[PDB]
Structures are given as structure tokens and as C-alpha cells.
């Protein structure tokens, strides 16, 4: 696991190792933010705030633990504060966010984590503080809701 080695180095004070974690995970954090409809005026800020908090909290992180799930727990909490207030192409991006925005919050978060950033069901469950079975249930609900929405919009 490349991330485990990088995280251990970052926790020991290596800002260059931390920079590599930012390079590896920053796109996926911003993707999630955009999926949640956070304004472009705020996406870069949230992503920055998430990594700055992660850096300062590395002292309380066991580097053997999965880094992405820990990082996304920080990130999602910061995103939740903002996305309630979500407002060329990208008319395409607005369409994606507005469709996902019609999902109830629980199924929106699970589908963004799994289908958009690419987390496994157990990884998403770890981020969300849910059982893996709860995640599997929410995914089913989300897919059913999306199918209807897409049927009605075509």
C-alpha cells in the first residue's frame, strides 16, 4: 500500500510525502464536492481545508489505517456544511448535480462515494459510520431513484 508508506512519512513530518497524498486524492475529493453541487467558488476552498485539517490531525492517525477513508470522513463533514445551500457545458455538471440532488441525503452520499469516487461498499461504510449491509441497502434505493428520475427526464 503506497498510501500507508506516504501517510507514515507525512505523519513523521514529511511535507513532500503529504504533497503526494494531495496529488493522489485531491481530484476525487473535488469530484465528490462537485457531485454534491457545491459552488465552484467553494470547491477549491473545501478541498484545501480538508487537506490542511488532515495534515494537522496526522499526529492522531495510525498510519496502518486506510488513509482515503480517514481523509474522506474529514472531507464529507466539511462538505455537508455547504451542500445544503447548493445553487456552458458545464451545463453538464449542473445537470449531474441537480439529478443527484433529488436523491435523499443518505443515498446521495453512498452513490457519490461508491459510484463516483470508486470506493468499495465496506470503504464507504467506514466513511459513513454504517454497516456494510446498510450501505448495500442505500445503494439499491439510490439506483432505483436514479432510474426513475432518468426515465422521467429523457
Amino acid at each position: 500500500d503506497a498510501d500507508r508508506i506516504l501517510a507514515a512519512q507525512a505523519a513523521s513530518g514529511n511535507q513532500r510525502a503529504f504533497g503526494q497524498l494531495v496529488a493522489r486524492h485531491g481530484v476525487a475529493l473535488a469530484q465528490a464536492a462537485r457531485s454534491f453541487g457545491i459552488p465552484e467558488t467553494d470547491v477549491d476552498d473545501v478541498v484545501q481545508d480538508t487537506f490542511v485539517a488532515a495534515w494537522h490531525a496526522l499526529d492522531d492517525f495510525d498510519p496502518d489505517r486506510p488513509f482515503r477513508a480517514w481523509l474522506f470522513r474529514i472531507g464529507l463533514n466539511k462538505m455537508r456544511d455547504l451542500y445544503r445551500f447548493r445553487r456552458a457545458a458545464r451545463l453538464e455538471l449542473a445537470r449531474v448535480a441537480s439529478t443527484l440532488g433529488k436523491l435523499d441525503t443518505g443515498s446521495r452520499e453512498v452513490i457519490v462515494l461508491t459510484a463516483i469516487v470508486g470506493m468499495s461498499q465496506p470503504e464507504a461504510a467506514a466513511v459513513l459510520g454504517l454497516s456494510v449491509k446498510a450501505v448495500e441497502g442505500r445503494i439499491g434505493r439510490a439506483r432505483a431513484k436514479l432510474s426513475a428520475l432518468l426515465d422521467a427526464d429523457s
Binding site: 485531491g26 481530484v27 469530484q31 477549491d44 495534515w55 436514479l146 432518468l150
Partner: peptide
Amino acid sequence: ADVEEWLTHARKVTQEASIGVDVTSIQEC
């Protein structure tokens, strides 16, 4: 609807929009 195909599209759209992440300004902190 083909939910899988749409999610693939959503993933691509959000990613292409998010390529310009600024590692430097994060390091500036």
C-alpha cells in the same frame, strides 16, 4: 433507465471538471 451508463457519464463529467487541483497552494499552508 441505464443507471450504470449514466453513472459512468457522471464520473467522467465530474472528473474532467476536477483535473485542475492546486497542490501548491495546499503546500503553501
